[model samples]
Target chain A: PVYMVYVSQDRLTPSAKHAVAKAITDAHRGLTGTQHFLAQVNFNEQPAGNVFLGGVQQGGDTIFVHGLHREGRSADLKGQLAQRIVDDVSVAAEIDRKHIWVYFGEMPAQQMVEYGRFLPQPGHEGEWFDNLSSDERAFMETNVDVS
Target chain B: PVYMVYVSQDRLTPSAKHAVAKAITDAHRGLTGTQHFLAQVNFNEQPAGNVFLGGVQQGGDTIFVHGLHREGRSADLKGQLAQRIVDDVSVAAEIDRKHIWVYFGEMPAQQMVEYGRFLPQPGHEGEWFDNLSSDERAFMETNVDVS
Candidate 1:
């Protein structure tokens, strides 16, 4: 499964989020050989620039998705998704397609690594890995034998 | 000559306007085959969106420009000018590339026919043409006999 992550700020309201969600879901409704295909909207409530550590500003929304077909690599899909998102959300809030960030994950497990480990790196590093917040980490670590 | 007009509702401070103007003048300072090239910033206290006939609210500083250049060319020149403008003005205030509208005058003017001497057509004419305020009609009557 390929996971695409979007990072946006708190400027988007809940209604705007709903509108974006509806558009993405509707656009991807009937694709062939696709399963567990879904878009999830997550709000960090912080400006994108602040949370994402890049040039992102605080006034946009991000859309994350997983399970895209590997055989057909198409920017058209990205364009369609971006256009739908802009059309839906811009009705209530100003959304510039240029402001959106779309990232695709190569490995399914990469999603778990990114969300669980990398994203929290800036705030907690030393204790982030060694502390292992839960037994899942221990099990994974033991299986991989990295420690 | 091709003219492109951008309307802004808020008046950028004199300093900001000057910054934009200076950048344009400097960037084209040594360029060849560029004429009637200039940038002008204006303040329209009125709201935007309504400026165009669709009740569109125009809120913020607007920039308008008119220039003459060789036909079917000048993308590189325009691009350079855009970069200079963005550098001079803060990136945030810099107009997005997509928002920039380019109009070619030579073609339109060649195709344009003077109808001032013709009788008004039914359901198509408006009193506003003859009753236009002095400032509104200044550009309308200019070079009326252009051949």
Candidate 2:
């Protein structure tokens, strides 16, 4: 099964989230035989503080998608995800769904980490994976799929 | 008495508000004859949905100052307010103080109008008021300085 994660910052009414989720689910329904699907959405309270650090703090929703599809045609899946995002989100939300980040990888599922660690979670050590050893944790956290 | 009102989408924490208020009061004190100063901070959850409507919905803080001053220029007062806001609000809450809007009138006192009356108000009546009506309201709200 390929995991598709969509992360965004900015205040989103529940309706907006629903729209985005539906878009992704509907578009990829045709890939059922070739790829299994999972979708997750994270809505941060504020815009990302620094865009260079992968923060989208422009008060509009940003979408990030990560998954593993058929080995040779990963680029096709990425384009499909980005196009669907632009068509789905609200015009008022001001998201250029074309700005969506999509990545397909061949690596094992255990190797990927989501952006949730960047947030300031209470009682968590250093924000990302606290259980992994220092070097291993750093490698997983910093290696973002910036597509 | 002169009133300085600052409005934004979210209320700054009490400390941030106090910092702005104190800076204005101190600046007034430095003037030779200024007296009876008042400051108010108002938060409206509905920021102008459109940035074109004079609403700031970005994550950063916005500072606004209103009143008449004899010695300090609007630019100078704006600088002072910016300094105070930066010091009191979180570094993450940095403000774009240059966006400050200034309105000057000969009146010494003004009445409070419902925030909903502002052009950017969530559901404002869509009509431009003629000068005659605006002038009449301004005349009633103005107070002569009798010191």
Candidate 3:
């Protein structure tokens, strides 16, 4: 699963970006109980005249948090996850919460591949983690940092 | 509807970006029969070390085409739409088709707003367009260009 955060160019300082990214990583991991290394957060900075909202161009204040997840979470759970993400990101980036929009969608887990293998179905993370090659597991443990 | 095209920084030439954006715009308009200006194609260039696949950092060859559409299209229709987009984007970018991934998700139309108004439910676009204020309609007709 991945979170694609969209912001206008120059909208976020380096420290602000770090905080927002950490907030997103924590929100996804804490809410979904997913592995720390599995939460991929990407920041996509938009150039001028590139974003439109309500048929009008948008300013730098808008932040769009678009998440893709594997199937099997309740709508209620997803709502709470989005809410927490919004609150945390707003505080981190110092943007207005009203300008932040969170949207999530789920697809079958089998459709996603990581470590050159298909992801396990939801609720099977422990077995999937145990089955990973020792080298892959070690790399994940040492190199990848959710923080 | 919006198509968020993600490519590695400096991977696509200016002409390639134009071609890919046109392809996306054309595909969505042709396949979904939606109004020309309603289809939004945004290019998101990712900096190095920000993308991963299979738990490993990725190179510039990867292009992820993520789309968000209003609910109501049939699964078969969406499949065809995705297939056409993949084929067209691969040709436009001159990238191997295998390196490209297209994923789409649908949400209720009411949840999305454009032109400072809620998007109409699928198949209700004509009424929605006709009711738009004269200035908004004029701007959409003259200023917005899908090509």
Candidate 4:
């Protein structure tokens, strides 16, 4: 299970949000080794003053993506994933990437299951991604490799 | 510094939102040993399908309060704060309270300040709160003491 991204509305249009969602999900799947993903991103609109960062008010265009994800990855992988999300989402939404800040909270593997199935844990690394179809693997290799 | 609570709309009246915000701020302040709580709660109302809890759709009324708080509370206090926020929000929002879920991320000290002043580390515990004025302390006693 991957953490879904929550984008503040007004920062992205409907189509932009879809693009960012797909980008994030594929990136996560490629990086984590998974394909069965649904409902991976959420765009929650906030009134101008509702969103804050660094204890200060953020511009209405600031899109804060909070990753509510399942756990098990190296710190480097997580950081790379975070930066990739910002890069792709910036292009997709046409917003300055600087305005985007990504934060994540880990969900334990044992507690997270979709359709009554256990997701691969962090200990599994990206083995699940490696086992994917060639087409899937190829996409992740080219698109998700933030290095 | 305080945890910011994100309240989903359509689940509660404006007044209800206010009550929940106040309750959460006070609850966090009371529990974490801060008296002058700032930047504590944010209410963001989303469409029905925007929120995914447990990997499924959540009703618009679902109140999800993500706590951006200082780290260093006892396991019991953390769990207790989680439950109390739900209880108070549920009552204030008049929702199933069961629908409420709270998640917290710890903020290290030195980065968190109140009214433009930095607070001590978690090791300082509630010395900050203990210094509240008589009226402030009495009010907090009446309103924030969950136990």
Instruction: Give the Å error, residue B65, model 1.
Output: 43
Model 1 agreement with the true structure over B1-147: per-residue lDDT tens digits: 222224454444434444444444344333432211211122112345444425554445344443333234366866665555445444434655444332322221121111111112222225535665665355334312211
C-alpha displacement of A63 in model 1, angstroms?
A: 8.5
DockQ of each: 0.03, 0.02, 0.10, 0.07
i-RMS values of the candidates, in order?
19.5, 21.3, 5.6, 9.1
User: In lDDT terms, which candidate is top?
Assistant: 3
Q: Each predicted model: what fraction of the native A–B Cα contacts (within 8 Å) does it retain?
A: 0.00, 0.00, 0.09, 0.08
Which tens-of-lDDT digit does each residue in A1-147 have in candidate 3?
Answer: 777778888788766776777788777778888876666667778775677888999767888988889889998999899899999999989988988998887865644544334567777889998987887687556425444
Best by DockQ: 3
Candidates sorted on DockQ, descending: 3, 4, 1, 2
lDDT of 3 by residue, B1-147 (tens): 888888888899998898898888888888888887787788877775455432344567777777889988776777678778878888899987656666677789989986667999988899999887899998877635555
CAPRI quality level assigned to candidate 2 from its DockQ score: incorrect
Relative to the unseen true structure, what is the Cα RMSD of model 3?
A: 7.3
Model 4 RMSD in angstroms: 8.7
Give the DockQ-based CAPRI class for model 1.
Answer: incorrect
Off by over 4 Å in 1: A1-9, A30-38, A48-79, A106-147, B1-147
lDDT ranking from best to worst?
3, 4, 2, 1
lDDT of each: 0.35, 0.36, 0.76, 0.59
Listed per prediction, chain B TM-scores read: 0.39, 0.41, 0.92, 0.70
lDDT of 4: 0.59
* Greater-TM-score candidate between 3 and 4: 3
Winner on TM-score between 1 and 3 is 3
lDDT per residue (tens digit) for residues B108-135 in model 4 = 7778765445666775647766665677
Writing each residue's lDDT as its tens digit, candidate 4 over A22-118 gives: 6666666666555423224555675677767778976677777778666667899888888887887788778888777788877544433332223
